[PDB]
Write a protein that binds this ligand. Structure first.
Ligand SMILES: Nc1ncnc2c1ncn2[C@@H]1O[C@H](COP(=O)(O)OP(=O)(O)O)[C@@H](O)[C@H]1O
Ligand SMILES: Nc1ncnc2c1ncn2[C@@H]1O[C@H](COP(=O)(O)OP(=O)(O)O)[C@@H](O)[C@H]1O
Ligand SMILES: O=c1ccn([C@@H]2O[C@H](COP(=O)(O)O)[C@@H](O)[C@H]2O)c(=O)[nH]1
Ligand SMILES: CC[N+](CC)(CC)CC
Ligand SMILES: NCCC[C@H](N)C(=O)O
Ligand SMILES: [Cl-]
Ligand SMILES: [Cl-]
Ligand SMILES: [Cl-]
Ligand SMILES: [Cl-]
Ligand SMILES: [Cl-]
Ligand SMILES: [K+]
Ligand SMILES: [K+]
Ligand SMILES: [K+]
Ligand SMILES: [K+]
Ligand SMILES: [K+]
Ligand SMILES: [Mn+2]
Ligand SMILES: [Mn+2]
Ligand SMILES: [Mn+2]
Lengths: 1058, 379
């Protein structure tokens, strides 16, 4: 049937802030969904607390809500928008969770909201692990031997039955959240206690081990006519026991005979039919015993996911757009296939003539106390994808596109290290983020494919391939650059070797290999993605490079082209925010008439959606790869300022090679990035900067340190040293030296320079003081405590800096305010991660404006010349991944660790902040008992905070010194023992639920290591805690507001702007 | 360095590596999109005289095995692939693809831009080609052989593949657990189907057995008369290479079965036969349908099935006699896929309901057949 008529308005549940296991893929999907439904003339209403999403762009939907994704808030939204239907399968687990709670709370009933795409029962059928196990048995599909548990005692009994190691999987969770592999009872109780508490339904499934079996996934789509298709099959490179999301995976499957594939295909379908998914897609997971083909069903996810996004990129079949259309009565046969020019229908199974590879991206270096072995709970922060004509080609391209500095299989251990085999061994047997390199090392060190197999359980089909590449590398190394004849090189390029890796082996510069290629006329050709293995033509330009004969790029001679370079995989600090900018550059320029060409390889993003640009090169963002594109595209300009560090870092070399970089110059960029260069300009401008020094030696430092004055910011991993004694200490464990600006307000300012005038995009005042990374700070726009006079001072320094640095497009400047004095922290001459937030807040699409600027259209010409100061407050707050790494001290500091952010909109700062806090998933309560344990320098201001809490009705506890100060001011908290002091102590109290709120501030490395237990416990037991007094106050203010009281749309917000 | 070369009528040359027999092969070149199932494909008689190109780069990942053979031998003239994996990795593997090609004496080339090739064929249609694998392949020779090629167009291929003597089949379908089962005992199958071997895929037989048939395989040229004499519960027209001439013997015989009330069912070639024999017209297709992801709509129930295709000729829908009703159409190109005799208990399907390889979506076509069969015996 055609579109549903009994439906007019639809509410789409967004995924919320980015976290490990629930990332950008939902922005990609939510956007596709918005696009699809608006295309079909529906009235779209959506909710997403994450402001850095293309999905919340005002022009994307009818009624956009950037509000905390809480059932009571959504309730207000429903109540206010009266949606006919609700689509809950495009927002990750957050969306499924909310839909069912809404359901549970009777809200859907109350406003007569019909659930589409998937039903409430279908969702539960899939999400409730016991129910899922029961459905499988009903359809004769086999599942691992397992047991349900609702308590630790129950749990222990199942373990008794399945033995160790056993797998623990919570109901109503994904990304492995709350689960793990228990090798022992001690491990067992820990994960169990963790999952029971995390499970929305407080339930676990405990299974016998299948660690080592092959792992597979299938992406399915089903329509109301019962039509059913397999969109893509995926074979995991890493075996069962390492979560799909933390695994290297490829498409399509590689080691299954047709017979086995059909059986898996059939089951897949059977699974959707049984769960009840009738109008949409789903991911079905399996385990296969390589020894006998024995098939086991693991799970099914009744929604779009990270694999669906990868599958959509992999094949060119837009799963979510299609599914959104299915949720409204269309059938597959009625829809056309996008990339095949609409010539063929959406009812068919794709066929691909290439190999797709996905490699997850980790950030273990940012979490030192964390367990870094790969398991069933995801730990990756992002992923990269690559396409090649062969698996080798595909694999190596992904490696060089991973952004971890590899150029392919770079060595991890020395050939001559006597202990090398033991290290390798361990890395193979117990996988970490570096396993892939270690496999190559293994082969260099003499272990056999069977030895590797035995330790890794990685199918030999893959292993042999890596081995052959190592063997090739050895020859390169033997013959050197002289043996790099054309036949040979060509061979090498065909296997995906990078010019950079070859250079290393031959001991020459990368540019030498590149030059070599030019001589030989050895360049790649471009193939197009088309979903049908070339069986039909395509009018879409979605391409990847490969070393073959025929090229399908067919660039235009026609228009002026503009190239936008993506950021590659997302990582902490290099998130979706830069992607958003990228997307906007392309949307604005395109609209303006340019031919837009995107270069990116992040499968999760809107940037790699073929609809976002005129041309898409799904390639590693590297010098080699970009040059090749420029080579044949001959663009008018290239933008390197919107994708984060990745492209920024190629700026000079691109220019050096003749690329037409537009906007702020590579040199300009360096002036600001280079400390020295930067320090001179400040000087030249007569601006204030913190005293600093560049020390070489320890003793040098101590002296110079005396010069600068403690505390000190030691930027080589950053540290805050407080005293001489502190200095050495660091040194041991251990160079810029800067005076740390204590008790200062940190500010961010985003702006645009066109050479003619400067546009202040936004002045953001951080809640957390300077010393807590801006990326991990909550912030307000407009400033909530900074004087207009002081703000005026910053605006001026920004203008002076802009002109002086020669900015052209976006810029970001960070200041510190101490004693009514402005200090410069840094200048980032490109798009910053606050950009999207500023855009949403103020209604000005800074990224679009600045791209226009970069392309030639001045600020005056566009009509964007005056700074917007909205009539409401906007507060951004972050989300931290500490919960994924329990051994890490969940404390803020000068290094960035958050993964995502949310935005709160309010009539007052207090309201904004309360919305942001809630949306951040805070467990804060308006009542109870608060714990106060503060550092010396906070002891003074804590009194006021203690009073405010008292005024709210909280009871108080305090540690010794804090109690003393409180006592003197007239406040007598109940005293609590420090762990070492006796019983009961904090830990006991926290573990017993005595507190609903904790304020614990600490200064000084040792005192930090000492107080570790408070923060760790606080997190483990879900109690809201603040680690800064500033944050404490903000929280206090919020107690006076009610986040659920009022909601407003983005369109509405924008409308109040004068 | 073991060279191999492929040359198209058009003169387009593909240089790569030999991975099969030494020598040459000439044939119509076609492309198959099947990501899995290369063994079953290679062993399909329908491929007789054809040079097979697979779109999926890595061919041979799982080796080979006897169970995965659709016929008694390799029917493909040659094999064109992009990459031959270093190893075969699958519990079912009994011999690596290269060795198998050798054993069967197949000329095969790897390492060529199959995508280029594919696009050429799609765009400019099917072409004859020649592969040459050896020490110093001669391109002009190759070119020469290509050009010289008579081609399929006006060739009786089925006669070439059909069985010399008639025989009995009573073996059913493979199972992961049991594998290929022991042939059943005549007295174990209810029905008795007579199957015309126009170069029949073994899975077709197996899946008929599965439904309770006991078969009797017969040569292509067998007379309706001789047939009738057996007292068949059902008459089955197998798949096979090329297309029948309105001229030939089977037509004639088919016509005679259609005068009777016996149930008739054809697959692929079988389908074309039924259509000709009914007064329909067949056409050669630009490049045809070869792959396993083909959407086919049952117009009668408005439902879609993903199927296994392998055909170069098709039944012209516009020239269909009024006694032939359209039952299915391709969702890719709208070409005719299924037909049923308004007046008789006869029907056919262009695709391969037996898959092998391929999706199982169309298996039910068999069922209608049994129905028919059962109702015929009722009378
Ligand atoms: N019985 C098992 N033995 C070993 N590994 C398993 C087993 N069951 C699942 N796994 C592993 O745990 C991962 C997470 O399980 P899954 O059911 O997919 O949970 P989630 O819904 O959180 O993704 C799987 O991708 C797989 O690697
Ligand atoms: N001299 C300083 N005084 C106080 N805080 C500072 C100082 N230098 C840096 N910081 C803190 O360190 C964080 C990171 O410093 P920054 O130089 O901006 O590094 P990055 O390149 O990571 O942005 C800042 O956001 C701020 O909280
Ligand atoms: O076992 C503990 C508990 C707390 N603290 C730290 O001491 C301060 C509070 O203790 P007091 O000053 O109230 O005595 C905080 O900075 C807290 O981090 C410790 O060093 N050790
Ligand atoms: C994975 C996202 N959450 C579960 C739905 C945990 C932070 C949202 C609260
Ligand atoms: N804006 C950062 C999050 C604050 C966290 N509650 C902490 O105080 O550590
Ligand atoms: Cl909720
Ligand atoms: Cl979750
Ligand atoms: Cl087993
Ligand atoms: Cl060589
Ligand atoms: Cl940890
Ligand atoms: K079971
Ligand atoms: K895995
Ligand atoms: K699930
Ligand atoms: K800060
Ligand atoms: K070649
Ligand atoms: Mn899941
Ligand atoms: Mn999973
Ligand atoms: Mn900074």
């Amino acid at each position: 049937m055609p579109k549903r008529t009994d439906i007019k308005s639809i509410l789409i549940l967004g995924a919320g802030p980015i976290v490990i296991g629930q990332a950008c893929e939902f922005d990609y999907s939510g956007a596709q969904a918005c696009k699809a439904l608006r295309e079909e003339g529906y009235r779209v209403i959506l909710v997403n607390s994450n402001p850095a999403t293309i999905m919340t762009d005002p022009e994307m939907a009818d009624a956009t809500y950037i509000e905390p994704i809480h059932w009571e808030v959504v309730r207000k939204i429903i109540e206010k928008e009266r949606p006919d239907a609700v689509l809950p399968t495009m927002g990750g687990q957050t969306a499924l969770n909310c839909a069912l709670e809404l359901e549970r709370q009777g809200v859907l009933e109350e406003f007569g909201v019909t659930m589409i795409g998937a039903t409430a029962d279908a969702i539960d059928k899939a999400e409730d692990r016991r129910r899922f196990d029961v459905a499988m048995k009903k359809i004769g599909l086999e599942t691992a031997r397992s047991g349900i548990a609702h308590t630790m005692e129950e749990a222990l009994a199942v373990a008794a039955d399945v033995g160790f190691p056993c797998i623990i999987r919570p109901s109503f969770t994904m990304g492995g959240s709350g689960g793990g592999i228990a090798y022992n009872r001690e491990e067992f109780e820990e994960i169990c206690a963790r999952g029971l508490d995390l499970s929305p339904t407080k339930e676990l499934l405990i299974d016998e081990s299948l660690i080592g079996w092959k792992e597979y996934e299938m992406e399915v789509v089903r329509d109301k006519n019962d039509n059913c298709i397999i969109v893509c099959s995926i074979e995991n490179f890493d075996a069962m026991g390492i979560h799909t999301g933390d695994s290297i995976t490829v498409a399509p499957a590689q080691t299954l005979t047709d017979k086995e594939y059909q059986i898996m295909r059939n089951a897949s379908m059977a699974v959707l039919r049984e769960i009840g998914v009738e109008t949409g897609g789903s991911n079905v997971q399996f385990a296969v015993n390589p020894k006998n083909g024995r098939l086991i069903v693991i799970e099914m996810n009744p929604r779009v996911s990270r694999s669906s996004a990868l599958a959509s990129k992999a094949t060119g079949f837009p799963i979510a757009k299609v599914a959104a259309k299915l949720a409204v009565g269309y059938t597959l046969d009625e829809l056309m296939n996008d990339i095949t020019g609409g010539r063929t229908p959406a009812s068919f199974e794709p066929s691909i003539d290439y190999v797709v590879t996905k490699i997850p991206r980790f950030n273990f270096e940012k979490f030192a106390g964390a367990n870094d072995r790969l398991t069933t709970q995801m730990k990756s922060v992002g992923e990269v994808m690559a396409i090649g004509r062969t698996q080798q080609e595909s694999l190596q391209k992904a490696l060089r596109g991973l952004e971890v500095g590899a150029t392919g299989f770079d060595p991890k251990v020395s050939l001559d290290d006597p202990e090398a085999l033991t290290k390798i061994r361990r890395e193979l047997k117990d996988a970490g983020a570096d396993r892939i390199w270690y496999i190559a090392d293994a082969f260099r060190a003499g272990l056999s494919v069977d030895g590797v197999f035995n330790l890794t359980n990685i199918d030999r089909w893959f292993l042999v391939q890596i081995e052959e590449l190592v063997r090739l590398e050895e020859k390169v190394a033997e013959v050197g650059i002289t043996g790099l004849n054309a036949d040979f090189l060509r061979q090498l390029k065909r296997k995906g070797f990078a010019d950079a890796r070859l250079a290393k082996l031959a001991g020459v510069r990368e540019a030498e290999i590149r030059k070599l290629r030019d001589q030989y006329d050895l360049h790649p050709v471009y193939k197009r993605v088309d979903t049908c293995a070339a069986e039909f033509a395509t009018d879409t330009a979605y391409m990847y490079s490969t070393y073959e004969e025929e090229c399908e790029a067919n660039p235009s001679t026609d228009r002026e082209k503009i190239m936008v370079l993506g950021g590659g995989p997302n990582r902490i600090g290099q998130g979706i925010e830069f992607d958003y900018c990228c997307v906007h550059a392309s949307l604005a320029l395109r609209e303006d008439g340019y031919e837009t060409i995107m270069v990116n390889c992040n499968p999760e993003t809107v940037s790699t959606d073929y609809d976002t640009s005129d041309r898409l090169y799904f390639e590693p963002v590297t010098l080699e790869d970009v040059l090749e594109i420029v080579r044949i595209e001959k663009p008018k300009g290239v933008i390197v300022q919107y994708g984060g560090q990745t492209p920024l870092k190629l700026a000079r070399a691109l220019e050096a090679a003749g690329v037409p970089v537009i906007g702020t110059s590579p040199d300009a960029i360096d002036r600001a990035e280079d400390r020295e260069r930067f320090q001179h300009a400040v000087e030249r401008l007569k601006l204030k900067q913190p005293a600093n020094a560049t020390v070489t030696a320890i003793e040098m430092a101590v002296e110079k340190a005396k010069e600068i004055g403690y505390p000190l910011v030691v930027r080589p991993a950053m540290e805050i040293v407080y005293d001489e004694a502190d200095l050495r200490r660091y040194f041991q464990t251990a160079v810029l030296l800067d005076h740390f600006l204590d008790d200062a307000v940190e500010v961010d300012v985003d702006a645009i320079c066109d050479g003619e005038m400067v546009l202040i995009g936004g002045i953001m005042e951080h809640i957390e003081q300077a010393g807590v990374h801006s990326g991990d700070s909550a912030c307000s726009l407009p400033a909530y405590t900074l004087s207009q006079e002081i703000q005026d001072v910053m605006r001026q320094q920004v203008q002076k800096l802009a002109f002086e640095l020669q900015v052209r497009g976006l810029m970001n400047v960070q200041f510190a305010v101490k004693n009514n004095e402005v200090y410069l922290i840094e200048v980032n001459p490109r798009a910053a991660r606050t950009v999207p937030f500023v855009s949403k807040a103020t209604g000005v699409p800074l990224a679009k404006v600045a791209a226009r600027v970069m392309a030639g259209k001045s600020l005056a010409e566009q009509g964007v010349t005056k700074e917007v100061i909205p009539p409401y407050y906007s507060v951004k707050e972050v989300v931290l991944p500490f919960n994924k790494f329990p051994g890490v001290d969940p404390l803020l500091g000068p290094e960035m660790r958050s993964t995502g952010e949310v935005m709160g909109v309010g009539r007052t700062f207090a309201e904004a902040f309360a919305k942001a806090q809630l949306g951040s998933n805070s467990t804060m309560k308006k009542h109870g008992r608060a714990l106060l344990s503060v550092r010396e320098g906070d002891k003074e201001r804590v009194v006021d905070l203690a009073a405010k809490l008292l005024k709210q009705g909280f009871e108080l506890d305090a540690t010794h010194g804090t109690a003393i100060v409180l006592g003197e001011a007239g406040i007598n908290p109940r005293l609590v023992n420090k762990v070492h002091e006796g019983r009961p102590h904090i830990q006991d109290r926290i573990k017993n639920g005595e507190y609903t709120y904790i304020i614990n501030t600490t200064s000084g490395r040792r005192a930090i290591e000492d107080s570790r237990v408070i923060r760790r416990s606080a997190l483990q037991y879900k109690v809201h805690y603040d680690t800064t007094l500033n944050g404490g106050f903000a929280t206090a203010m919020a107690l006076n507001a009610d986040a659920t009281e009022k909601v407003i749309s983005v369109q509405e917000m924008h409308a109040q702007i004068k | 360095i073991k060279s191999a070369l492929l040359v198209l009528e058009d003169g387009t040359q593909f240089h790569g590596r030999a991975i099969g027999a030494t020598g040459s092969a000439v044939g119509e070149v076609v492309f198959n999109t099947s990501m899995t199932g290369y063994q079953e494909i290679l062993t399909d008689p329908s491929y007789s005289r054809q040079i097979v190109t697979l779109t999926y780069p890595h061919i041979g990942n799982v080796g080979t095995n006897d169970a995965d053979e659709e016929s008694s031998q390799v029917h493909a003239q040659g094999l064109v692939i992009r990459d031959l994996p270093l190893i075969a990795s699958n519990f079912r593997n009994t011999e690596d693809l290269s060795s198998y090609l050798k054993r069967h004496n197949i000329v095969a080339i790897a390492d060529i831009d199959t995508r280029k090739l594919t696009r050429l064929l799609r765009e400019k249609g099917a072409q004859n080609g020649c592969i040459i694998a050896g020490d110093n392949p001669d391109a002009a020779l190759a070119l020469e052989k290509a050009r010289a090629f008579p081609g399929l167009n006006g060739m009786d291929l089925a006669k070439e593949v059909t069985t010399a003597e008639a025989y009995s089949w009573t073996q059913g379908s493979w199972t992961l657990t049991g594998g290929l089962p022991e042939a059943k005992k005549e007295d174990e199958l209810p029905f008795h189907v007579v199957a015309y071997d126009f170069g029949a895929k073994r899975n077709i037989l197996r899946m008929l057995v599965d439904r309770g048939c006991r078969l009797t395989i017969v040569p292509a040229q067998t007379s309706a008369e001789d047939v009738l004499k057996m007292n068949p519960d059902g008459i089955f027209l197998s798949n096979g290479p090329g297309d029948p001439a309105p001229d030939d013997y089977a037509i004639t015989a088919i016509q005679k079965f259609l005068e009777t009330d016996i149930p008739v069912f054809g697959i692929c070639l079988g389908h074309q036969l039924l259509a000709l024999a009914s007064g329909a017209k067949t056409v050669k297709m630009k490049f045809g349908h070869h792959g396993g992801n083909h959407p086919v709509k049952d117009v009668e129930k408005n439902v879609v099935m993903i199927t296994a295709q392998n055909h170069g000729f098709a039944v012209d829908e516009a020239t269909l006699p009024a006694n032939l009703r359209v039952t299915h159409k391709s969702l890719f190109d709208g070409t005719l896929q299924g037909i049923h005799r308004t007046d008789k208990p006869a029907f056919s399907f262009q695709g391969h309901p037996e898959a092998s390889p391929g999706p199982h979506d169309a298996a039910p076509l068999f069922d209608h057949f049994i129905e028919l069969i059962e109702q015929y015996r009722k009378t």
